[PDB]
Amino acid sequence: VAECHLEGREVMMVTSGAVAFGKQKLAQELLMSLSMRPRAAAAVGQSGLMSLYDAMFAQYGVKIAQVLV
Amino acid sequence: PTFTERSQLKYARRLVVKLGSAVITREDNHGLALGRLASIVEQVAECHLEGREVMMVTSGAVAFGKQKLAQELLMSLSMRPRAAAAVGQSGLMSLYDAMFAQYGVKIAQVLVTKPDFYNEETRNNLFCTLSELISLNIVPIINTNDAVSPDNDSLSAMLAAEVQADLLILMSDVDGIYNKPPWEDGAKLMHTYTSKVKAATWALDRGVSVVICNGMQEKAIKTIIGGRKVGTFFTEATESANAVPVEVMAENARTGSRQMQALTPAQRASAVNTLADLLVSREKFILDANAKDLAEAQKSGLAKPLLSRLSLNPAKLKNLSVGLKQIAEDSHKNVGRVLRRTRLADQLELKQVTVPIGVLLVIFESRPDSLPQVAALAMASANGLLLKGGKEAAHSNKALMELVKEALATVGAEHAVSLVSTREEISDLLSMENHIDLIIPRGSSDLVRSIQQQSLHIPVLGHAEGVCHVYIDRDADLEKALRIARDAKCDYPAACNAMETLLIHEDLMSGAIFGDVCNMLKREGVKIYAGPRLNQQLTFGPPAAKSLKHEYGALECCIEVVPSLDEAINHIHTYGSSHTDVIVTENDAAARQFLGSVDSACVFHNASSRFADGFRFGLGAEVGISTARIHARGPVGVEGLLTTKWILEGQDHAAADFAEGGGRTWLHETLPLD
Amino acid sequence: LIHEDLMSGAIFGDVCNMLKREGVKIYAGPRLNQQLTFGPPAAKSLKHEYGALECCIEVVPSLDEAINHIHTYGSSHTDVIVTEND
Numbered sequence: 001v002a003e004c005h006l007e008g009r010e011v012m013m014v015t016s017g018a019v020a021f022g023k024q025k026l027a028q029e030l031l032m033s034l035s036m037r038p039r040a041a042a043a044v045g046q047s048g049l050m051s052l053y054d055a056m057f058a059q060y061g062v063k064i065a066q067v068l069v
Numbered sequence: 070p071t072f073t074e075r076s077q078l079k080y081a082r083r084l085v086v087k088l089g090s091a092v093i094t095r096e097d098n099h100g101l102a103l104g105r106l107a108s109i110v111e112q113v114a115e116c117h118l119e120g121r122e123v124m125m126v127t128s129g130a131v132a133f134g135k136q137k138l139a140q141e142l143l144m145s146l147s148m149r150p151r152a153a154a155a156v157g158q159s160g161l162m163s164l165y166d167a168m169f170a171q172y173g174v175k176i177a178q179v180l181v182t183k184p185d186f187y188n189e190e191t192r193n194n195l196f197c198t199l200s201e202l203i204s205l206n207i208v209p210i211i212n213t214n215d216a217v218s219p220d221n222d223s224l225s226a227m228l229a230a231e232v233q234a235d236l237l238i239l240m241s242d243v244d245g246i247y248n249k250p251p252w253e254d255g256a257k258l259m260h261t262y263t264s265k266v267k268a269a270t271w272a273l274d275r276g277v278s279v280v281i282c283n284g285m286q287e288k289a290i291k292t293i294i295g296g297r298k299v300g301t302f303f304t305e306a307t308e309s310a311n312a313v314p315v316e317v318m319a320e321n322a323r324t325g326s327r328q329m330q331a332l333t334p335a336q337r338a339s340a341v342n343t344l345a346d347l348l349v350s351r352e353k354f355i356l357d358a359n360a361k362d363l364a365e366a367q368k369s370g371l372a373k374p375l376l377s378r379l380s381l382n383p384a385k386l387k388n389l390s391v392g393l394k395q396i397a398e399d400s401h402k403n404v405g406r407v408l409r410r411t412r413l414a415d416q417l418e419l420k421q422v423t424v425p426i427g428v429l430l431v432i433f434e435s436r437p438d439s440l441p442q443v444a445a446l447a448m449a450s451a452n453g454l455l456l457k458g459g460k461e462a463a464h465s466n467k468a469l470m471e472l473v474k475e476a477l478a479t480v481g482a483e484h485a486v487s488l489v490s491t492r493e494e495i496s497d498l499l500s501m502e503n504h505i506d507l508i509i510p511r512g513s514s515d516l517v518r519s520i521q522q523q524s525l526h527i528p529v530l531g532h533a534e535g536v537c538h539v540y541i542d543r544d545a546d547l548e549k550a551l552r553i554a555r556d557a558k559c560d561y562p563a564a565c566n567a568m569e570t571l572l573i574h575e576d577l578m579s580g581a582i583f584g585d586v587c588n589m590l591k592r593e594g595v596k597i598y599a600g601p602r603l604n605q606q607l608t609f610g611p612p613a614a615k616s617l618k619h620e621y622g623a624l625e626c627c628i629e630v631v632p633s634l635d636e637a638i639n640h641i642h643t644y645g646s647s648h649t650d651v652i653v654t655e656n657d658a659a660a661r662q663f664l665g666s667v668d669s670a671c672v673f674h675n676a677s678s679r680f681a682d683g684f685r686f687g688l689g690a691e692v693g694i695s696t697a698r699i700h701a702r703g704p705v706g707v708e709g710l711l712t713t714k715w716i717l718e719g720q721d722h723a724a725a726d727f728a729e730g731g732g733r734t735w736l737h738e739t740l741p742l743d
Numbered sequence: 744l745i746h747e748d749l750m751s752g753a754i755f756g757d758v759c760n761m762l763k764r765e766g767v768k769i770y771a772g773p774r775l776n777q778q779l780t781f782g783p784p785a786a787k788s789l790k791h792e793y794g795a796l797e798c799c800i801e802v803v804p805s806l807d808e809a810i811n812h813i814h815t816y817g818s819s820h821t822d823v824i825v826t827e828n829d
């Protein structure tokens with residue numbers, strides 16, 4: 001994607017599946033709650049995933065900006 | 070809601086913050102003021118780690134993104150807002166993540182908008198998201214979905230509403246709400262309360278406690294959670310009249326002073342007579358009241374000083390009655406008395422007279438015996454008076470207060486007296502101004518010390534340290550000094566006017582009188598230390614004194630010896646609090662030497678430090694012991710509460726009339742003063 | 744500050760004339776603002792300070808009212824009374 005953009009074409013990723021990010025990131029509180037007791041994990045994963053994309057893309061110098069719809 | 074007073078605020082389990090768009094951006098909206106933001110996140114992490122539940126609502130992301138680009142906005146404003154806020158949203162989120170995680174707490178961005186509260190299915194959805202979050206020890210940051218946006222405060226309010234949160238904190242730039250625009254006399258910062266204002270009403274209408282603080286104020290949360298009077302608190306609970314918050318008290322008292330101003334001739338005299346009569350007539354009520362409150366104190370078992378002084382016996386009441394009758398009979402010509410009578414020129418008759426001070430405020434620990442004494446002082450001195458005791462005696466204080474309110478009601482009838490109970494927050498009390506004149510602390514070192522450390526920009530009568538000194542000269546009779554110091558220490562060794570030191574001529578180490586007085590102190594069981602020079606002197610002797618500027622109160626007395634008069638003088642000035650001292654000798658040359666050289670508040674010659682009682686001076690009933698360098702030294706009677714006021718009754722005189730034009734010259738003839 | 748009665752004898756006008764003679768930028772008190780048609784401009788704030796040739800002027804009904812205004816605004820610095828009743 002960074003390549004096709006650096007070429008000069010115009011791209012707008014639509015990354016599905018943030019839930020997995022957050023699900024992994026907690027991995028402890030879901031553990032301790034499934035013994036004493038989904039979307040929220042996706043919210044926290046949304047944050048983290050965004051950061052990760054920022055790091056990686058910026059390593060090509062391109063900048064990004066989260067958009068929610 | 071349910072909470073009513075700032076006292077209740079240690080008991081809210083769910084909190085919501087909403088930082089303002091001005092507390093975080095620096096004074097450009099073109100960057101980020103960080104220190105404030107850091108303070109905020111630290112306080113928030115604290116309140117959460119406590120176990121309370123918090124959901125920040127950080128406004129103002131635009132500044133983050135605006136700074137982060139700073140280059141493309143540059144290159145576009147030469148070839149050509151919300152987008153910057155989106156990118157800033159991302160970055161700001163990361164930053165919060167780093168910082169919060171440095172306390173171990175985790176967070177999770179959440180985006181909403183005002184329409185998202187209006188439809189009900191989304192209400193369900195978002196509330197489910199929030200509950201699932203809070204259940205997991207996560208602090209969601211709640212920004213608005215700028216993306217869908219044409220100051221986000223209504224948002225936080227109605228958020229707390231849907232959540233039905235305990236307390237909504239709403240930080241901001243302004244300190245609080247005033248009575249009126251600030252460019253206006255009477256900008257009374259309305260701490261409680263019977264734009265932001267509307268939204269606050271709204272949230273209150275949703276059964277929600279709201280508070281609006283100032284961002285720049287440190288520890289604002291930790292401050293406001295304590296119950297401290299800060300920011301602006303909102304509740305119409307309006308339980309009681311609670312006649313004065315703090316201040317209409319003060320103005321009233323001013324009015325009452327103005328009132329009694331026109332009641333000198335036997336008026337206040339007969340009034341305090343009436344007070345003494347009420348004291349000696351209805352004592353049963355107040356006696357049982359103190360018995361009750363003393364029993365209440367017993368289960369508490371606070372302090373044998375307190376647990377001893379809060380006592381009261383009808384003998385004490387007889388003492389108070391005779392003291393009050395004395396004050397009455399002798400308090401005849403204290404006010405209005407003229408001090409100068411002079412004529413500058415024909416029909417130019419200046420004279421300077423006696424006038425009250427104004428709003429006196431006493432402070433003392435539970436000792437209801439003093440209360441009527443100082444009340445008699447006020448009333449005979451025709452000036453207003455406030456009061457604040459401690460915790461105990463409170464009911465006794467009320468009884469005495471009613472008695473004295475009656476007593477003043479007879480003539481003049483104006484209640485130029487009050488009482489500030491229910492934990493008025495002494496520091497806040499002294500934070501006032503423009504009303505109170507003389508802080509008259511009365512309890513003990515602590516009390517007065519805490520005061521002097523807390524008091525700022527307000528006159529504070531009284532001292533804090535009782536380091537006195539006793540010099541003994543080479544030509545002083547031995548047994549004389551023996552009995553003298555014997556009493557000086559062993560009459561009420563916990564007094565203020567005590568000799569926590571004893572200085573002796575170098576010569577008299579030879580006559581073993583040092584040994585004799587050590588024997589005497591032992592007789593009385595006095596833990597004595599030694600001076601560095603004394604440390605050098607003997608083999609091991611008594612142990613070395615810790616510090617020369619220390620205080621004992623109990624049966625302890627440092628002892629040190631120096632060569633000469635002048636050396637003693639210098640040591641005094643170096644360590645003495647200029648409070649009190651005495652010399653014992655038979656040379657009057659040296660006597661006068663000392664007399665002058667000394668700079669104590671009061672100095673004696675062959676007498677006892679325990680003489681500093683004012684009453685002992687025939688100085689009427691004392692009010693305090695002042696060591697300040699102005700207006701008052703040590704034993705202050707009533708006249709330490711009287712200032713002067715120049716008055717002048719000309720006929721047709723003017724300023725330039727005494728210039729070369731008008732035949733007006735100068736006489737300054739000291740008329741016989743009345 | 745001037746008694747309310749003496750607004751009738753136009754002495755207010757006389758002293759305005761005098762201040763003009765001396766070139767004194769005078770303001771007016773809220774009560775005085777109410778009093779005349781437009782007159783001198785309204786005083787900004789009663790607890791303000793001028794130093795230069797300026798002097799707010801205001802009139803109140805009674806002695807005691809004046810006293811209260813003084814205590815309200817006066818810095819307890821200095822004052823004088825002019826009258827013939829002792």
Ligand SMILES: N[C@@H](CCC(=O)O)C(=O)O
Pocket residue numbers: 183184213218220221222223224
């Ligand atoms: N966006 C506005 C409200 C928009 C509206 O619904 O009128 C706010 O957050 O205060």
